[PDB]
Design an enzyme around this catalytic site. Structure first.
Site, PDB file in Angstrom:
ATOM      1  N   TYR A  98      55.903  69.659 103.301  1.00 44.12           N
ATOM      2  CA  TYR A  98      56.881  69.579 102.231  1.00 44.12           C
ATOM      3  C   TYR A  98      56.306  70.225 100.966  1.00 44.12           C
ATOM      4  O   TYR A  98      55.253  69.813 100.478  1.00 44.12           O
ATOM      5  CB  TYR A  98      57.247  68.100 101.966  1.00 44.12           C
TER       6      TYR A  98
ATOM      7  N   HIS B  16      63.478  71.208  98.734  1.00 46.13           N
ATOM      8  CA  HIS B  16      64.833  71.090  98.169  1.00 46.13           C
ATOM      9  C   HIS B  16      64.982  72.048  97.000  1.00 46.13           C
ATOM     10  O   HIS B  16      64.061  72.177  96.157  1.00 46.13           O
ATOM     11  CB  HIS B  16      65.055  69.659  97.654  1.00 46.13           C
TER      12      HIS B  16
ATOM     13  N   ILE C  18      66.736  80.457  95.827  1.00 46.61           N
ATOM     14  CA  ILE C  18      67.326  80.607  97.136  1.00 46.61           C
ATOM     15  C   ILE C  18      66.959  81.999  97.651  1.00 46.61           C
ATOM     16  O   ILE C  18      66.524  82.135  98.785  1.00 46.61           O
ATOM     17  CB  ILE C  18      68.846  80.371  97.109  1.00 46.61           C
TER      18      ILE C  18
HETATM   19  C1  LIG Z   1      64.828  71.951  90.717  1.00 45.41           C
HETATM   20  C2  LIG Z   1      64.497  72.997  91.730  1.00 45.41           C
HETATM   21  O1  LIG Z   1      65.398  73.618  92.282  1.00 45.41           O
HETATM   22  S1  LIG Z   1      62.862  73.250  92.075  1.00 45.41           S
HETATM   23  C3  LIG Z   1      62.650  74.287  93.502  1.00 45.41           C
HETATM   24  C4  LIG Z   1      62.738  75.775  93.140  1.00 45.41           C
HETATM   25  N1  LIG Z   1      61.665  76.318  92.302  1.00 45.41           N
HETATM   26  C5  LIG Z   1      61.868  76.530  90.997  1.00 45.41           C
HETATM   27  O2  LIG Z   1      62.974  76.393  90.496  1.00 45.41           O
HETATM   28  C6  LIG Z   1      60.696  76.874  90.092  1.00 45.41           C
HETATM   29  C7  LIG Z   1      61.126  77.966  89.122  1.00 45.41           C
HETATM   30  N2  LIG Z   1      61.222  79.297  89.753  1.00 45.41           N
HETATM   31  C8  LIG Z   1      60.153  80.055  89.955  1.00 45.41           C
HETATM   32  O3  LIG Z   1      59.026  79.716  89.639  1.00 45.41           O
HETATM   33  C9  LIG Z   1      60.372  81.396  90.605  1.00 45.41           C
HETATM   34  O4  LIG Z   1      61.692  81.835  90.206  1.00 45.41           O
HETATM   35  C10 LIG Z   1      60.157  81.357  92.133  1.00 45.41           C
HETATM   36  C11 LIG Z   1      58.953  80.471  92.488  1.00 45.41           C
HETATM   37  C12 LIG Z   1      61.380  80.817  92.883  1.00 45.41           C
HETATM   38  C13 LIG Z   1      59.868  82.799  92.572  1.00 45.41           C
HETATM   39  O5  LIG Z   1      58.597  83.187  92.032  1.00 45.41           O
HETATM   40  P1  LIG Z   1      58.246  84.668  91.597  1.00 45.41           P
HETATM   41  O6  LIG Z   1      56.796  84.731  91.176  1.00 45.41           O
HETATM   42  O7  LIG Z   1      59.244  85.064  90.568  1.00 45.41           O
HETATM   43  O8  LIG Z   1      58.503  85.494  92.964  1.00 45.41           O
HETATM   44  P2  LIG Z   1      57.923  86.911  93.392  1.00 45.41           P
HETATM   45  O9  LIG Z   1      57.728  87.770  92.190  1.00 45.41           O
HETATM   46  O10 LIG Z   1      56.808  86.651  94.348  1.00 45.41           O
HETATM   47  O11 LIG Z   1      59.250  87.343  94.215  1.00 45.41           O
HETATM   48  C14 LIG Z   1      59.147  87.860  95.545  1.00 45.41           C
HETATM   49  C15 LIG Z   1      60.517  88.029  96.245  1.00 45.41           C
HETATM   50  O12 LIG Z   1      61.487  87.038  95.911  1.00 45.41           O
HETATM   51  C16 LIG Z   1      62.797  87.570  95.667  1.00 45.41           C
HETATM   52  N3  LIG Z   1      63.221  87.115  94.322  1.00 45.41           N
HETATM   53  C17 LIG Z   1      62.458  86.410  93.469  1.00 45.41           C
HETATM   54  N4  LIG Z   1      63.105  86.129  92.306  1.00 45.41           N
HETATM   55  C18 LIG Z   1      64.326  86.685  92.408  1.00 45.41           C
HETATM   56  C19 LIG Z   1      65.526  86.794  91.544  1.00 45.41           C
HETATM   57  N5  LIG Z   1      65.570  86.256  90.306  1.00 45.41           N
HETATM   58  N6  LIG Z   1      66.594  87.469  92.046  1.00 45.41           N
HETATM   59  C20 LIG Z   1      66.593  88.024  93.275  1.00 45.41           C
HETATM   60  N7  LIG Z   1      65.541  87.974  94.117  1.00 45.41           N
HETATM   61  C21 LIG Z   1      64.404  87.325  93.740  1.00 45.41           C
HETATM   62  C22 LIG Z   1      62.627  89.084  95.710  1.00 45.41           C
HETATM   63  O13 LIG Z   1      63.290  89.518  96.882  1.00 45.41           O
HETATM   64  C23 LIG Z   1      61.188  89.393  96.083  1.00 45.41           C
HETATM   65  O14 LIG Z   1      60.399  90.247  95.270  1.00 45.41           O
HETATM   66  P3  LIG Z   1      60.716  91.702  94.659  1.00 45.41           P
HETATM   67  O15 LIG Z   1      62.188  91.976  94.920  1.00 45.41           O
HETATM   68  O16 LIG Z   1      60.357  91.426  93.211  1.00 45.41           O
HETATM   69  O17 LIG Z   1      59.753  92.569  95.435  1.00 45.41           O
END
Ligand SMILES: CC(=O)SCCNC(=O)CCNC(=O)[C@H](O)C(C)(C)COP(=O)(O)OP(=O)(O)OC[C@H]1O[C@@H](n2cnc3c(N)ncnc32)[C@H](O)[C@H]1OP(=O)(O)O
EC number: 2.3.1.258
Length: 154
Positions: A73, A112, A121
């Site tokens: 998880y 989640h 997503i």
């Molecule tokens: C309450 C909750 O829902 S918590 C559970 C979810 N997590 C969070 O909400 C934490 C906040 N979000 C984050 O930290 C980030 O947005 C994460 C962890 C989801 C992604 O982390 P990042 O470091 O931005 O991802 P990374 O740069 O490795 O992205 C890799 C891939 O993901 C996809 N991706 C990531 N962000 C996006 C976006 N905003 N839009 C579209 N595709 C995306 C892309 O296909 C791909 O990379 P590229 O197209 O840049 O080559």
């Protein structure tokens, strides 16, 4: 990895306050003191992520034995908004997937995601996670209250 500005580091009693500070900013739910005590006991299942040696994200997971399966998880995985789309998420997720692959005993990995969180997503679906359920009223105080369960089969 050659020349990468991103590194993962261990969570310890010296930097656990840094992890909490990051979690507060990044996630819309607060985690209690027990959460942070537990993080110190999961070894490599928790890491801080550094960009050019600045702490900008973290991943905390735990092993879950439910549904008669052994599951990983992902409790929290994220980084600060200005450092997103630089591959930090990928580095953290790949770390956890490599732990599961080398262990070989996990049925699946899951988390989640609030239904409004389009970027999360997109990110997890890129790594082969699937929306397997939508849980209504998962969150008690934030809106939307619903969360997708994203799961990758191993
Ligand atoms: C309450 C909750 O829902 S918590 C559970 C979810 N997590 C969070 O909400 C934490 C906040 N979000 C984050 O930290 C980030 O947005 C994460 C962890 C989801 C992604 O982390 P990042 O470091 O931005 O991802 P990374 O740069 O490795 O992205 C890799 C891939 O993901 C996809 N991706 C990531 N962000 C996006 C976006 N905003 N839009 C579209 N595709 C995306 C892309 O296909 C791909 O990379 P590229 O197209 O840049 O080559």
């Amino acid at each position: 990895s050659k020349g990468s500005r991103i590194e993962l580091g261990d969570v310890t009693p010296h930097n656990i306050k840094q992890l909490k500070r990051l979690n507060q900013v990044i996630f819309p739910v607060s985690y209690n003191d027990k959460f942070y005590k537990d993080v110190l006991e999961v070894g490599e299942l928790a890491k801080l992520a550094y960009f050019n040696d600045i702490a900008v994200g973290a991943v905390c997971c735990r092993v879950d034995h439910s549904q008669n399966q052994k599951r990983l998880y992902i409790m929290t995985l994220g980084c600060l908004a200005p450092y997103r789309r630089l591959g930090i998420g990928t580095k953290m997720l790949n770390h956890v997937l490599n732990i599961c692959e080398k262990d070989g005993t996990f049925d699946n990995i899951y988390l989640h995601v609030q239904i409004s969180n389009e970027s999360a997503i997109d990110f997890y679906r890129k790594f082969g996670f699937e929306i397997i359920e939508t849980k209504k009223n998962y969150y008690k105080r934030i809106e939307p209250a619903d969360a997708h369960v994203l799961q990758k089969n191993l």
